[PDB]
Amino acid sequence: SRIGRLPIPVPKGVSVEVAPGRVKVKGPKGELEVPVSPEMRVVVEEGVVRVERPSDERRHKSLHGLTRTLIANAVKGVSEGYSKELLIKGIGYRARLVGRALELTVGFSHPVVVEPPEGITFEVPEPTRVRVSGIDKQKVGQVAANIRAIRKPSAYHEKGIYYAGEPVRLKPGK
């Protein structure tokens, strides 16, 4: 019933050195940095990284779980990476890859091209499944939200761009 105390499994070889207000995390698939509150303490154990809180008042209790799960996600990013899949639904609808960019054909009049930032790399298996890959969890999560937003899952029909595992809830029409 608490996340600030659950220590962080650090696989090998992940490099989690600590700085005042920073925690650097070098991994096999890249490096990330974590801004950590200067009131929290990050600790380096044998293959484990642990975070301690300086008190038990609300803010130090709130910062605690955060600056853990933050340093957690950075270890799982540089090592085994983060992905997110987008299914496409709608008769005319389809998406393709133009070099290192993504061109959606989602029923406007133009087609829409997304540009993957630094870190994000697109990939399209089928013409109806897009995949966003990157070591940053938050950044992967933005891009996927970004892309999906272009044609959010409609209300009445099974048309739009859907999150992996998105419930297909609709409403009657007549």
Footprint of Mg ion on 94-123 (CB under 5 A): none
Contact region for RNA (CB under 7 A) — 39-47, 65-73, 92-100, 121-129?
65-73
Measured from the CB atom, the residue of 4 and 90 that comes closer to RNA is: 4
Instruction: Return the one option of Mg ion, RNA, none that residue 36 interacts with (CB less than 5 to 8 A, by type).
Output: none
Please give the residues from 124 up to 153 whose contact with RNA meets the rule CB under 7 A: 137-142, 144-146, 149
| C-alpha closest to that of 52 among 14, 6, 10 | 6
* Token pair belonging to 165: 């595992």
Within 13-42, the residues that bind RNA by CB under 7 A are 35, 37
Smallest gap from Cβ 73 to Mg ion, in A, equals 10
Residue 118, number of CB atoms within 10 A of its CB: 8
Calculate helix-pair angle for 137-149, 58-80, nearest 10 degrees. 80
Residues 6+ apart with CB under 8 A from 78: 14, 25, 26, 27, 28, 29, 30, 31, 32, 135
Indicate which of RNA, Mg ion, none lies near residue 112 (CB less than 5 to 8 Å, by partner kind). none
The residues of the shown chain that bind RNA, judged by CB under 7 A, are 1-4, 35, 37, 58-59, 61-66, 68-70, 73, 84, 137-142, 144-146, 149, 155-156, 171, 173-174
